[PDB]
Amino acid sequence: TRSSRAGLQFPVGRVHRLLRKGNYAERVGAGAPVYLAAVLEYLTAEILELAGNAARDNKKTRIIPRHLQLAVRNDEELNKLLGRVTIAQGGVLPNIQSVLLPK
């Protein structure tokens, strides 16, 4: 493969195909399917990280959409990135405005 040759889990082949076929440019370098597959791999790790955490915190062995949402909205940097994305079955973070609380 090449996932091997770059220590990646993410299909370095698949990616090289998709760049060429998805009409981004005439020609496509050798490093880029690797650079990108990596960045894709990197980021899917950070999510899987904090969601899993969240599934532990929420006492489950399996990650459901909520755990993703919690991971995402609680992370300041990830939340920005997915600033315009609604995640199916995410729900919302619990947040109740002060002045609404009892006295």
Binding site: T86, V92, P94, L101
Partner: protein, 97 residues
């Protein structure tokens, strides 16, 4: 014993922000969807996932919207949301004119 005005409203907020289940019964929603589309094209079929997709997108949107609505209510030293808030929310979003 009776619970006071807004006490059950407070308990309900907690309950819904803790859950991720959809809040409009999917059947009348589904009928609303077909109605609206018929106005664009006749004799049409929907994938059940196509209806869910719409449902999720719409609710998520409305919730977000109430959030921002609610802030305007609060901005006006109020605690009740009112149509004039929604209009301001949307106006500033640049949704409405």
């Amino acid at each position: 014993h009776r619970y006071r005005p807004g006490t059950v409203a407070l308990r309900e907020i907690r309950r819904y922000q803790k859950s991720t289940e959809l809040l409009i019964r999917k059947l009348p929603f589904q009928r609303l969807v077909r109605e609206i589309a018929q106005d664009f094209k006749t004799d049409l079929r929907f994938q059940s996932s196509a209806v869910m997709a719409l449902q999720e997108a719409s609710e998520a949107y409305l919730v977000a919207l109430f959030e921002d609505t609610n802030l305007c209510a609060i901005h006006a030293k109020r605690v009740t949301i009112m149509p004039k808030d929604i209009q301001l929310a949307r106006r500033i979003r640049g949704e409405r004119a």
